[PDB]
Amino acid sequence: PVILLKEGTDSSQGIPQLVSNISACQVIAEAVRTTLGPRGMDKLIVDGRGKATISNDGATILKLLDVVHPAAKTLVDIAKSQDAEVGDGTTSVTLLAAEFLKQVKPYVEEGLHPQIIIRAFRTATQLAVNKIKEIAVTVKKADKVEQRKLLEKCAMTALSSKLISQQKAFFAKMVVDAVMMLDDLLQLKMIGIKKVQGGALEDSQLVAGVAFKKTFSYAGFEMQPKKYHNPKIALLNVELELKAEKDNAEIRVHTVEDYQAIVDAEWNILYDKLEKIHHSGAKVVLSKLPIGDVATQYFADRDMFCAGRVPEEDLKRTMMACGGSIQTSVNALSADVLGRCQVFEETQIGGERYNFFTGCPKAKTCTFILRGGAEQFMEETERSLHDAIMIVRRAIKNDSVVAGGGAIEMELSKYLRDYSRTIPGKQQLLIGAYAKALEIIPRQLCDNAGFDATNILNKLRARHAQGGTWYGVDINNEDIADNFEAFVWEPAMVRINALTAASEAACLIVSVDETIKNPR
Amino acid sequence: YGRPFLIIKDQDRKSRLMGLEALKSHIMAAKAVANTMRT
Amino acid sequence: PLSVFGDRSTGETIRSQNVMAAASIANIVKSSLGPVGLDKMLVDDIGDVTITNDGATILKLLEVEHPAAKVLCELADLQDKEVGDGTTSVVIIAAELLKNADELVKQKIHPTSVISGYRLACKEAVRYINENLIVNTDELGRDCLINAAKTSMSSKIIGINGDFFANMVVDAVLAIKYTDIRGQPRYPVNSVNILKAHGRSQMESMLISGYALNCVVGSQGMPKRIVNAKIACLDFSLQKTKMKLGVQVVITDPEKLDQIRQRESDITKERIQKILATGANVILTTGGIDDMCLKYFVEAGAMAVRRVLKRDLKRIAKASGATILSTLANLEGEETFEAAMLGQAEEVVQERICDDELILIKNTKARTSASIILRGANDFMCDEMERSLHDALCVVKRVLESKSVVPGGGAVEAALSIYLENYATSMGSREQLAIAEFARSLLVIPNTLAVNAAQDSTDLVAKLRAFHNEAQVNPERKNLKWIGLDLSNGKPRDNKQAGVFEPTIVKVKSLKFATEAAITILRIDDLIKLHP
Amino acid sequence: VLVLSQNTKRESGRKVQSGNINAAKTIADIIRTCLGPKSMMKMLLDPMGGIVMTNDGNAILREIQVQHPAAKSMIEISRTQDEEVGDGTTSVIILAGEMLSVAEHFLEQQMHPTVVISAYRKALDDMISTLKKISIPVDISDSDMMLNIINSSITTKAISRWSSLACNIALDAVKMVQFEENGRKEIDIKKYARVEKIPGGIIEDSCVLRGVMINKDVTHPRMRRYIKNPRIVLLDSSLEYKKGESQTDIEITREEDFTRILQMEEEYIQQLCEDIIQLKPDVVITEKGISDLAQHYLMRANITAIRRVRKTDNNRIARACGARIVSRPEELREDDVGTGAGLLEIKKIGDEYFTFITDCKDPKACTILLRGASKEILSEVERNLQDAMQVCRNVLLDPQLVPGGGASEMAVAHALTEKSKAMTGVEQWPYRAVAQALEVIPRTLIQNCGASTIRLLTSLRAKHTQENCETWGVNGETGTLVDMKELGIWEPLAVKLQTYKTAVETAVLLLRIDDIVSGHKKK
Amino acid sequence: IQDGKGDVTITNDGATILKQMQVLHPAARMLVELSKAQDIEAGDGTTSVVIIAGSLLDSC
Ligand SMILES: Nc1ncnc2c1ncn2[C@@H]1O[C@H](COP(=O)(O)OP(=O)(O)O)[C@@H](O)[C@H]1O
Ligand SMILES: Nc1ncnc2c1ncn2[C@@H]1O[C@H](COP(=O)(O)OP(=O)(O)O)[C@@H](O)[C@H]1O
Ligand SMILES: Nc1ncnc2c1ncn2[C@@H]1O[C@H](COP(=O)(O)OP(=O)(O)O)[C@@H](O)[C@H]1O
Numbered sequence A: 001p002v003i004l005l006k007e008g009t010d011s012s013q014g015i016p017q018l019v020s021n022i023s024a025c026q027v028i029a030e031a032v033r034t035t036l037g038p039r040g041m042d043k044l045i046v047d048g049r050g051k052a053t054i055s056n057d058g059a060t061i062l063k064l065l066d067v068v069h070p071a072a073k074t075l076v077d078i079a080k081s082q083d084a085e086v087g088d089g090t091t092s093v094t095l096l097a098a099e100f101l102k103q104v105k106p107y108v109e110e111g112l113h114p115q116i117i118i119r120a121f122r123t124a125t126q127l128a129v130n131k132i133k134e135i136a137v138t139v140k141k142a143d144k145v146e147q148r149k150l151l152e153k154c155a156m157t158a159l160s161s162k163l164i165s166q167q168k169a170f171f172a173k174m175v176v177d178a179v180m181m182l183d184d185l186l187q188l189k190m191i192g193i194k195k196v197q198g199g200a201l202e203d204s205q206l207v208a209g210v211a212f213k214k215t216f217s218y219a220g221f222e223m224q225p226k227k228y229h230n231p232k233i234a235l236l237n238v239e240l241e242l243k244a245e246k247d248n249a250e251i252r253v254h255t256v257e258d259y260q261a262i263v264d265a266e267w268n269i270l271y272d273k274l275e276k277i278h279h280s281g282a283k284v285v286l287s288k289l290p291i292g293d294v295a296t297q298y299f300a301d302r303d304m305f306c307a308g309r310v311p312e313e314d315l316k317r318t319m320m321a322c323g324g325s326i327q328t329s330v331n332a333l334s335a336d337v338l339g340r341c342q343v344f345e346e347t348q349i350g351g352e353r354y355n356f357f358t359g360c361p362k363a364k365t366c367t368f369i370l371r372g373g374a375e376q377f378m379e380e381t382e383r384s385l386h387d388a389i390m391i392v393r394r395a396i397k398n399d400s401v402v403a404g405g406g407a408i409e410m411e412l413s414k415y416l417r418d419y420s421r422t423i424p425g426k427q428q429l430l431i432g433a434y435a436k437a438l439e440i441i442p443r444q445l446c447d448n449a450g451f452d453a454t455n456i457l458n459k460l461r462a463r464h465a466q467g468g469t470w471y472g473v474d475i476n477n478e479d480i481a482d483n484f485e486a487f488v489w490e491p492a493m494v495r496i497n498a499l500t501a502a503s504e505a506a507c508l509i510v511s512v513d514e515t516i517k518n519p520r
Numbered sequence B: 001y002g003r004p005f006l007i008i009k010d011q012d013r014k015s016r017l018m019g020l021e022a023l024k025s026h027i028m029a030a031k032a033v034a035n036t037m038r039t
Numbered sequence C: 001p002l003s004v005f006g007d008r009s010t011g012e013t014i015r016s017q018n019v020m021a022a023a024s025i026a027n028i029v030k031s032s033l034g035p036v037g038l039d040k041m042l043v044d045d046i047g048d049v050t051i052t053n054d055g056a057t058i059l060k061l062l063e064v065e066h067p068a069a070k071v072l073c074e075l076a077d078l079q080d081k082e083v084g085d086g087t088t089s090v091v092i093i094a095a096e097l098l099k100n101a102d103e104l105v106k107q108k109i110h111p112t113s114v115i116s117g118y119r120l121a122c123k124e125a126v127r128y129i130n131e132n133l134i135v136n137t138d139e140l141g142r143d144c145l146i147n148a149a150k151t152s153m154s155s156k157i158i159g160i161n162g163d164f165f166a167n168m169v170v171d172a173v174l175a176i177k178y179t180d181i182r183g184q185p186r187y188p189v190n191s192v193n194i195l196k197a198h199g200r201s202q203m204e205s206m207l208i209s210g211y212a213l214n215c216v217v218g219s220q221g222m223p224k225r226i227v228n229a230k231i232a233c234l235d236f237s238l239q240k241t242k243m244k245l246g247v248q249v250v251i252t253d254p255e256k257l258d259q260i261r262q263r264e265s266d267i268t269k270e271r272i273q274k275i276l277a278t279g280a281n282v283i284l285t286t287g288g289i290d291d292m293c294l295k296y297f298v299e300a301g302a303m304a305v306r307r308v309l310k311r312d313l314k315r316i317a318k319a320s321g322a323t324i325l326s327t328l329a330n331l332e333g334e335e336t337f338e339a340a341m342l343g344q345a346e347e348v349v350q351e352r353i354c355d356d357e358l359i360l361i362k363n364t365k366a367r368t369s370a371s372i373i374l375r376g377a378n379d380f381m382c383d384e385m386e387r388s389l390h391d392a393l394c395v396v397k398r399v400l401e402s403k404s405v406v407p408g409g410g411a412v413e414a415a416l417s418i419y420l421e422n423y424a425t426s427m428g429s430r431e432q433l434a435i436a437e438f439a440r441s442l443l444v445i446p447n448t449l450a451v452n453a454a455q456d457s458t459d460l461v462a463k464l465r466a467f468h469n470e471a472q473v474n475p476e477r478k479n480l481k482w483i484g485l486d487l488s489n490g491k492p493r494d495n496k497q498a499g500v501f502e503p504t505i506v507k508v509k510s511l512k513f514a515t516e517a518a519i520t521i522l523r524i525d526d527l528i529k530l531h532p
Numbered sequence D: 001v002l003v004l005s006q007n008t009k010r011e012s013g014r015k016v017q018s019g020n021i022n023a024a025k026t027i028a029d030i031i032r033t034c035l036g037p038k039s040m041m042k043m044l045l046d047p048m049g050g051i052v053m054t055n056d057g058n059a060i061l062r063e064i065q066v067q068h069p070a071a072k073s074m075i076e077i078s079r080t081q082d083e084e085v086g087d088g089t090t091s092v093i094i095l096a097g098e099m100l101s102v103a104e105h106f107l108e109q110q111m112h113p114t115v116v117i118s119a120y121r122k123a124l125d126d127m128i129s130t131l132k133k134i135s136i137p138v139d140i141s142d143s144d145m146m147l148n149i150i151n152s153s154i155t156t157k158a159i160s161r162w163s164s165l166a167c168n169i170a171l172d173a174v175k176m177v178q179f180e181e182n183g184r185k186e187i188d189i190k191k192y193a194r195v196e197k198i199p200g201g202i203i204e205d206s207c208v209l210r211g212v213m214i215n216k217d218v219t220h221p222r223m224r225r226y227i228k229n230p231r232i233v234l235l236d237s238s239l240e241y242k243k244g245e246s247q248t249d250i251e252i253t254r255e256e257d258f259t260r261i262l263q264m265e266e267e268y269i270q271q272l273c274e275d276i277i278q279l280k281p282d283v284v285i286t287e288k289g290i291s292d293l294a295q296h297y298l299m300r301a302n303i304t305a306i307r308r309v310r311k312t313d314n315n316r317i318a319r320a321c322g323a324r325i326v327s328r329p330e331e332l333r334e335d336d337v338g339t340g341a342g343l344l345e346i347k348k349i350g351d352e353y354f355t356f357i358t359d360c361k362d363p364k365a366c367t368i369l370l371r372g373a374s375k376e377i378l379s380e381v382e383r384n385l386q387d388a389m390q391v392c393r394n395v396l397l398d399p400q401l402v403p404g405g406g407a408s409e410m411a412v413a414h415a416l417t418e419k420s421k422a423m424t425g426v427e428q429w430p431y432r433a434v435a436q437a438l439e440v441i442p443r444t445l446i447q448n449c450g451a452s453t454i455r456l457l458t459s460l461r462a463k464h465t466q467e468n469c470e471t472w473g474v475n476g477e478t479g480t481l482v483d484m485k486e487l488g489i490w491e492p493l494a495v496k497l498q499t500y501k502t503a504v505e506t507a508v509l510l511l512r513i514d515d516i517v518s519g520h521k522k523k
Numbered sequence E: 001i002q003d004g005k006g007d008v009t010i011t012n013d014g015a016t017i018l019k020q021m022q023v024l025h026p027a028a029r030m031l032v033e034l035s036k037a038q039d040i041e042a043g044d045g046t047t048s049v050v051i052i053a054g055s056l057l058d059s060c
């Protein structure tokens, strides 16, 4: 007879569907399991075009994996949310979610209500958030250098398990000076990231102005001086070339008199505009529209520099660094709409021509010159720089950091285990499993270097029970030490966000009962 | 009955390797390149 | 590098694949374990329904191309061949042990320590089973056997009507009782003829005191009711005389071919007359019977059955006291026949059972036989009833062979898990985790029972763990280890009183097989599959 | 490719039970078309190329190819019911379908199947007890009662206009089939009542011959064809010179050895013929061939010979005459000569010779002759006669009678409802559900008759509530409430008991399946 | 080890594993004969000799 649904619709039950979902989610944890601790490594993803993608962050790995499973897409969503929120612990949330799923798999297979599990997860997440907010340990009034020292320590901690781990003390001051000079709203788009082929890691410099690549020149570019003491930058936006007035125009000349009159008046208008631009006392002319050869030859005879085809972002950065404004017309070129700098040179760095505009006391932006490899190395360096900038911005906006490592997780697990000895019934087993699943961070941190994770975990549990609050792990000492005194500080909001994302993902996965699929 | 589930797109065409064999292959390729660009 | 011409894995992938295969094999037959489980169905390509739930048959008729699956199947087959009961519980315990050991292997623990801890826990559990033994002779005997048979037949199709089948099995076991060489009494099985015939319900299947043959009479002119007959077992075909290959016939005179052709039948006639010279009435021939022998038996007034099995003839000769004679020769050079080796029976009446007849033999004078004629709907129900009866007979034999009964329902597993958990604190090394995992692996039977019963699993598990923990301490309350578990109400009942009654040798063998299977699999870390 | 099994499809849960219940309901709705005297006939087309036109419940179900295991189990239980008692093949299927359809109401209320099976067995036991308690005895010496029972049993088939003779035919066949040999064993086999089908003639020409009817002819026209009181003898061995399996060779070197052998062959043939004609027989019936010399000798001795016979035909001839088959001609004796004949006439039925052995002393094997139109009518008449004979045999084996139609079902339902008030727990709802499930036969009969169940059902339910109101049924011809004592409709108790037991067993077997595994290729 | 006919073999001796591996390279086809000769002569240490030979050939 006539069928009900469309022919080719896949259906499932409840317990087997949940078991399959758990088994599928357990595989995603193995992809971001090695990239975690400082001794961890990275992965290499190849697309269908033949381009290598080397990135240590779990977000890029999950984005380049292209998963088609309906249950495995929950990890990518929470990873993207964590990357957009603070941009730090992208794999810790996935590991915690996988541990929670593996812990509740036997409880689900035994025959438990999913609503009770969701309520227990919510209660445990609320208790962990309250405990973290209680032991946040924040300050109210500090010194001027204390904030800079805290920022440098946070940058060195965030740049510990990255590729530039050998030079973490050099980029810390750079990112500190970059974030400190970012006005008050913290504009991330104002920081320019340039990648020039050639040079090592020690050749990377940080300018206090703006810098961009040399655009396409003409024939009168090598006839003008490329060095000025105290010039005047005039940011314009009109085209400086010989062309028609309007595209919807028509000239109906009569004789040759008016023809020659118009021919001469065109050049007269061009020269009047070039003089009005020159009468403003400027020396550097920058515009978004391409500049013709006539204006380039006219500016070279008066010892003036000019450059066209300037991007919008570069022009905005130069305006924010100097202190000018975008002028469309050239009929109002005063003195308050012109830039000012202390030096302007043009050297050869890596075989490419670049311009520098350093020496601006009223600048609110900067430009980074990242060197090293060729493509993957520069991309990893840019990702690490962005992560450090985000960490410093969060530390400035929240001024609340806790001890790093596996001390906070151990303290939370101990608190949850001590609290489980009060509420009877079936709620004790769920809280105990949630507390036992929180100890996966130190085990994975110690297993990345080939150490005895069981003995270290037992020693940490004994130290937490005998007290001895911020006791974490150690890689160089092959033992345990105080992470609060080892200058290891991390933002406390990152852990809260990761815990909330993991709880939401676990609740959404448990809430899934029947999965219906449609063809095409 | 453990039914296999589809995870990565086009899983029946791609290949995944551990790590030690990949490092050994990369070292061998680098050695071959250095031997070729030696004369 | 390394040209192997095939496929290979690494280290953890093969272990994960084996664990997944074991879990799938366990979940395949995880709905027919407890007494509340239902049966399955197996259909082939031509359309043959196979309704069964013993576990061993389902694993044998599965055809899986996995090494761990084949290992579990052969282990279940060995368990069924050596015992016959508990073919799925051992596989489930082995799968749970493998799943528990996988977590320890993933925690950077050497498999040798885990294997040593598992062996120590198994040895401690085996040593602890002897502490909870009940003497079979101290109870009533008949009631204990009836309870054991009802427990063994509780997870079958005749679980409700277990008051008559258990008594019939006990009577058949008591009738089929063989004595050894003046020592311990034996109880041989696989000797009772379990016939299958469609007819009425299963409650009408009574016990036939004697033997039952699945053959019909030869000629229609022979009587079908002989009182006080003589059973004569023969092991040679009753046909005409035929020369061998090396002995040819070369007729040289026409006055001898007719004489030879007449003697060829006269020899058989004289042999038949000498066989029937002792006054025999029942003659069984395993070979063929010609028309002349049939006419002779009809004229003499005696029955003749052709195409008889060897085992049936041996059982008939052992029950009636006759001797199977393959020839008529003696200690000289004359073919004679004595009357001292003739089996004396009583009433040999042929009864028709639904459009087919079969000869039944009642009790004789030497020993006592037993025959069961099971009646049901079609062939699947008859096969299920036969399998259930065979399992009940095997359980009764294993119980009577070793006078040692042990209560069931999930209390023994909880007691063993508590004992191993309390003993693990005395080690102090890395084997404590292995002992704890071995103890937790035995708790999968109550969980599966509660899942199949659709009751509270965690609550019942907690109640059992709280009731068994108080039985260890406080010597004034040492009778709390025999509470058991009920699936119809969800509360500990009497159990040990008269509810569940299972032997201990079966459980010991199942635990040993599960330990051996968990040991022989955990020592695998690489696979090499060649291409055909 | 790395998988555990290949081309395997496993399905578990409530879907398997739902599909089984749907298949059972479809089978019951298909088989419910043929029920009651107001039913219609069907027509099946076998893959061979014939035409199957009948009305039996088993002959129609056996010609339907299905693929569901539930349908296969239903066909199997129907075939077992037809091979057990012979009658009641559709009622059992309808009852099983109704019991499986009314069982799905409890499966959706988180009810365990073990309690359902326990309630089913407890209801089956009570139904058996009630049927044994309401048993009414009957005498076997009354021929009118047996004729009325046979007529009421065959009133549904197409012999409703000719049962005036078929009843007597079945009675005579049952009386002649019953034979007592040695001991206290009284068997009633059906392998001796051969039914012959000859196309042509009218249906009123059928009768029961006191003997058999072999479709053969004489070997020579010079033999006799009409004997008064002949002495029919039997043989088994061949009447010709055969070879030997002992590998014999006759090496001759003279000249007259061939003539000597050829003369000795004829001498041996004549000696065998003289040994055959020893007690002066008349009609020789052998199973093998007869040479020309033996035929000439029997013609000279005025003996009739018939060759190429069957074993069943020879056994029937020996049972009708009263002799035994002899293999060796030298051991004929005297008691082996059959003298129970009285008429040996060879007629022609449509250009075909037929042997008739009529008028015997005390025959124990008869041959029913049927004359109809084509072959389907003859097959239907033979099936109806076999069903009537099986019903008569089941009645003679157990002298018990119960009111048919729908009175016994209503009485059992009332007895189960009056006893269900003392029960408690979860075993009360399935009991009351299966107690009212027995009304599927009278409801179907009313639907097939006048198609007015909404009134007759409650009229019969309100009538059986009284005391002496357990024999009130529903007339399938008109459609009114009439008494079964004055109508004359009766049925045996063993058939109903077997039907109930088979239905309960099928329901129990089908209510314990929740997994389907297919794709293992057996081996 | 799983052969082409479907026989699953589990062994710990290096000689049996090398024989069941079925290699195709002569440098690998000589090691199986070496292990067979070592097992025929002595019987034990069939894996240590292969390890020593591999270490020597790698140091060469
Ligand atoms: N120098 C260090 N000392 C102690 N713990 C560290 C150090 N560097 C990183 N960690 C730990 O390693 C974990 C991984 O951090 P990271 O790799 O920066 O981001 P993600 O959490 O996304 O992998 C953090 O939870 C942190 O506690
Ligand atoms: N009547 C009963 N009461 C309580 N438990 C039972 C009963 N019958 C069986 N069981 C439990 O079911 C389990 C399986 O028994 P059984 O079916 O005989 O073995 P298998 O499942 O291997 O065929 C046993 O461990 C036993 O404890
Ligand atoms: N003339 C009649 N009067 C009353 N009841 C009848 C009559 N004919 C048939 N029946 C009833 O109809 C039921 C069905 O009978 P029928 O169709 O002949 O065979 P089956 O029982 O195999 O379906 C019987 O149980 C019988 O009681």
Ligand SMILES: [Mg+2]
Binding pocket: A087, A088, A089, A090
């Ligand atoms: Mg990070």
Ligand SMILES: [Mg+2]
Binding pocket: C085, C086, C152, C155, C391
């Ligand atoms: Mg059992």
Ligand SMILES: [Mg+2]
Binding pocket: D087, D088, D153, D156
């Ligand atoms: Mg009928």
Ligand SMILES: [Mg+2]
Binding pocket: E044, E045
């Ligand atoms: Mg050695």
